[PDB]
Amino acid sequence: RNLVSLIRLVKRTISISNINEQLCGEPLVNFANALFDGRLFCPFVHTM
């Protein structure tokens, strides 16, 4: 439960820069941090 809450806190801490504006279709944090975007697919997936 603490590891799940830790990952919640990491999402908070680098979702500081969240502002209500899209530019093309992407939110501004998708523009900010590559951890919050479509391009960073990640190494392990089970469906798509």
Binding site: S15, N18, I19, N20, Q22, E26, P27, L28, N30
Partner: protein
């Protein structure tokens, strides 16, 4: 029922309803807890 400045979590609302979920999947910058993502326009009266 998202009605107030508080008590308006998108992560709660878009899981009970699918219509909010396809609204947020098209506009992901309203998934933020911080400011006001929009209420229904009769409920969204900030200056009042």
């Amino acid at each position: 029922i998202p009605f107030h400045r508080f008590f308006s979590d998108p992560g709660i609302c878009g899981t009970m309803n699918a219509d909010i979920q396809v609204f947020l999947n098209t506009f992901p910058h309203y998934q933020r807890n911080d400011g006001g993502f929009p209420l229904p326009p009769p409920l969204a009266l900030e200056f009042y």
